[PDB]
Curated annotation (Swiss-Prot), chain A:
Protein name: Neurogenic locus Notch protein
Cell compartments where the protein resides: Cell membrane; Endosome; Endosome, Multivesicular body
Maturation and modification: Upon binding its ligands such as Delta or Serrate, it is cleaved (S2 cleavage) in its extracellular domain, close to the transmembrane domain. S2 cleavage is probably mediated by Kuz. It is then cleaved (S3 cleavage) downstream of its transmembrane domain, releasing it from the cell membrane. S3 cleavage requires Psn.
SUBUNIT field: Homomer. Interacts with Su(H) when activated. Interacts with Dx via its ANK repeats. Interacts with Delta via the EGF repeats and the Delta EGF repeats. Interacts with Nedd4 and Su(dx). Interacts with O-fut1; the interaction glycosylates N and transports N to early endosomes. Interacts with Akap200; the interaction stabilizes N/Notch protein levels by preventing Cbl-mediated ubiquitination and subsequent lysosomal degradation of N/Notch.
Phenotype reported upon loss of the gene: RNAi-mediated knockdown in the larval brain neuroblasts abolishes the expression of pnt, induces the ectopic expression of erm, results in the ectopic expression of Ase in type II neuroblasts (NBs) and their premature loss. Simultaneous RNAi-mediated knockdown of pnt partially restores normal neuroblast numbers and inhibits ectopic erm expression.
Source species of the chain: Drosophila melanogaster (Fruit fly)
Function noted in UniProt: Essential signaling protein which has a major role in many developmental processes. Functions as a receptor for membrane-bound ligands Delta and Serrate to regulate cell-fate determination. Upon ligand activation, and releasing from the cell membrane, the Notch intracellular domain (NICD) forms a transcriptional activator complex with Su(H) (Suppressor of hairless) and activates genes of the E(spl) complex.
Curated annotation (Swiss-Prot), chain B:
Residues of the full protein shown: 515 to 557 of 949
Taxonomy, superkingdom: Eukaryota
Assembly behavior: Interacts with N.
Protein name, per record: E3 ubiquitin-protein ligase Su(dx)
Tissue expression summary: Expressed in pupal wings, at the boundary between vein and intervein territories.
Limits of the WW domain: 7-40
Function: E3 ubiquitin-protein ligase which accepts ubiquitin from an E2 ubiquitin-conjugating enzyme in the form of a thioester and then directly transfers the ubiquitin to targeted substrates. Down-regulates Notch/N signaling pathway, probably by promoting Notch ubiquitination, endocytosis and degradation. Involved in wing growth and leg joint formation.
Amino acid sequence: NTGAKQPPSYEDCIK
Amino acid sequence: VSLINEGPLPPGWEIRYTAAGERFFVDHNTRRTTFEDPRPGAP
């Protein structure tokens, strides 16, 4: 699956 | 109502919608993330 986009980061961003 | 009273959520998961117009899934149990809803297994 090629196609870089906005990276999902919930808990990984708020820590 | 129109996007707040829809069907029930998946078990122990979170689901988000980016400003790019795309949908993603979030697993609080292992901090993993994915583009779809695959079989349980390797990351």
